[model samples]
Target: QQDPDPSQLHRSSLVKNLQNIYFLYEGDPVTHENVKSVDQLLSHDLIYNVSGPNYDKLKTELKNQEMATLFKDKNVDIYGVEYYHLCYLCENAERSACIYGGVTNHEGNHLEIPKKIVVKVSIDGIQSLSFDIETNKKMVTAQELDYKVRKYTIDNKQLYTNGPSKYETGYIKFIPKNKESFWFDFFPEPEFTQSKYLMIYKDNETLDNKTSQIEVYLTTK
Candidate 1:
């Protein structure tokens, strides 16, 4: 079977690849003594410069070009020596936070991972219903997908075997139909409330091209 496209890779596949890429690299060593004074590692020229033409402009342009190249090549380029401090912070924090709001600092010099991107999932409540899904792209309220749920008291039921509805936005939303308890298998087999799920169907005898289905759940009192 042919491999799936990058976007076609399952959510678990994406996460696994990202984690693997992150561990494949060995970053610069950080020592206690150097960590404290890491602030000195920032390039002063790259920070706070007048937008117009100036000597600093040339330095900034060159640095930005280098950064772009690094990103394109998926290489970890470290320009700021003090970036170790930011790495330390990221390592210790439960959630990753950006370092230096708009200023260049030791933590600012870093190369980005190529072919890997962070995917964020957002949940929002409308009236009494909650919508949840994972998306790599930003969403506008006007473009949000419409969803509805039906409750089935039976064990191992199929929500929609044929396919999703036309207004569906890559996922289906299921809420308890009548405040009754029920369970159903999301087309991809195992399902979990905390994770985004995707189902794929291949054309007969051919795996190169496939269609995917996504579904999420919401519960109410």
Candidate 2:
């Protein structure tokens, strides 16, 4: 039930919207009042800096340290953000990557609950793909007996579950597949407030293909 289009917003005035959008914040995020487009939000150096020192040079500085190795083989991280999280991988760096096994965005400042998500999966074509989403609790992890040993009774305290058409206490979902390109509009389920995650698995059942083209857009008005 989202508008799905902001054609008029583009027609209004980019200058008026992003009057002072150059700076970025580490502990802070960009407010909706100042950003008119997703691209503009990502352009800020504080949000995503491509021209900085190479990936290896940044690891020593970024406190997270782990994120420094990501997208090393690629040209740049096309998907920029402010307070957003990623469950993504890279191929080359032309801003294209295959997503299956799983994918997710640890939602944050930019995406309000009642927002629009336009997703395009396998835009070029299909090449043997499948993935799902599962809820991952914050800071804490559930228990585990043994993978090859025996089955354990999963409980609500566990990390993920089989299927979730509707939102759970802290869960994510993905199903109704069998398509190359499609999108979904998501809203908060009651008072759900946990983070989301994507589970993934892929195989080269098919030969060298055009590669998966995925694009996700989240906007709130």
Candidate 3:
């Protein structure tokens, strides 16, 4: 969807409603230095098996060493690092199981699930709005698939999804057994240029199957 051109009022209103949302399974506290330090290393050399105080720290250190200096001239932002890590770890285990004695290339196994899904929306070809959706299911059946997108206003107010003017419903299905992912690109209308949103939903089959609806926003340069 194409977002509207941002106006002063929209920008001001969005700024007033900005909030910090944290993950439920906080993997590890991410040190600011780890995130800030990684660019130079990734650019000049290719290295594998990064290690440190923890996974998050190790990744941050790796990126800082490879790509840190590359962003010195421009403003860059990072999000979903933890989410990416979780997905990576989940996928790795699944692949390892496949290589060993678990799921084979032709047979269905417990390791074929998707750990997470991501949706990214970009505006003006520069600014990006992204969200990560993750699942902890070890084995998901086709009969267990029930998905919906819950929408909210910029002020965190709930919006009804009933008719033509209703919010967008981005649904995904056929998720693998291990971890799955999805992405979307939107060019929001002018009225929504500076708007922020959070998507919430639930899986009815799994007990306590609540998942987070990520919050994302679009801004102009």
Candidate 4:
């Protein structure tokens, strides 16, 4: 398999579509060179600006009305470009150095992938932890699913999945109990949270494995 293209990899398909819409709104053509990074290719003021006044001006001028409105609410809009860099490091985890020190000519842009993901399940004082790699993608065992303890060594090399170089996908799951579960299949663009207190409810209540009831406290290392 060919390596995953840096241009197409994004933290979320929604974000990727937003970048495309933004590029079209600016009358710019999407190209490999341009789509390599979100903020680098898209105008920061339009897609990544957090200033409400700036967006107010954008709305007042009737420039990209819908997109402007979407980003106008600073409370609702998502910004920042570091995740693009972080996703690269994650999708390229098989690289000799999974931790991206930085890109050439990009000052102070080094980033680390959240390989060591710790989850705190709310039921029965249970907790689970797993690395975002292939080794943990098996049918859940009792102890593996409920480790009770939380600890990790943050080794960059532990991120490897031993799959096709660029297209290699990482899989990790947290089966909290017979009744609940949570998991992440990091794909084209890997995602991790920097918010230490981010709380997420169970994926689903039905036994549809795809969605099960479980609270997860995502912590990155």
Top candidate, metric lDDT:
3
| lDDT of candidate 4 over 64-182, digit per residue (tens) | 34433433333221111112122221222332111111111122212233123233332112354333221121221222222212112112222212221221222234553354344
Full ranking by TM-score: 4, 3, 2, 1
Better of 1 and 4 by TM-score: 4
Enumerate clash totals for all models, in the order shown: 1, 5, 40, 2
Error of 4 at 33 (Å): 28
Q: Which tens-of-lDDT digit does each residue in 138-158 have in candidate 1?
A: 210101111112112111122
Tens-digit lDDT track for model 3 on 140-170? 2111222111122221222221212122322
Superposed by TM-score, candidate 4 places the C-alpha of residue 192 at a distance from the truth, in angstroms, of 20
Q: Report, for every candidate in turn, its global Cα lDDT versus the true structure.
A: 0.20, 0.20, 0.25, 0.23
TM-score of structure candidate 3: 0.20
Q: Which stretches of candidate 4 lie over 4 Å from their true place?
A: 1-46, 50-71, 75-117, 120-154, 161-169, 173-183, 187-221
The candidates, ranked best first by lDDT, are 3, 4, 1, 2
**RMSD of every prediction:** 19.6, 20.9, 18.5, 18.4
Q: With candidate 4 superimposed using the best TM-score fit, by how many Å does residue 172's alpha carbon deviate from the native? A: 3.8
lDDT, model 3, position 53: 43
* Model 1 residue pairs with clashes: 83-106
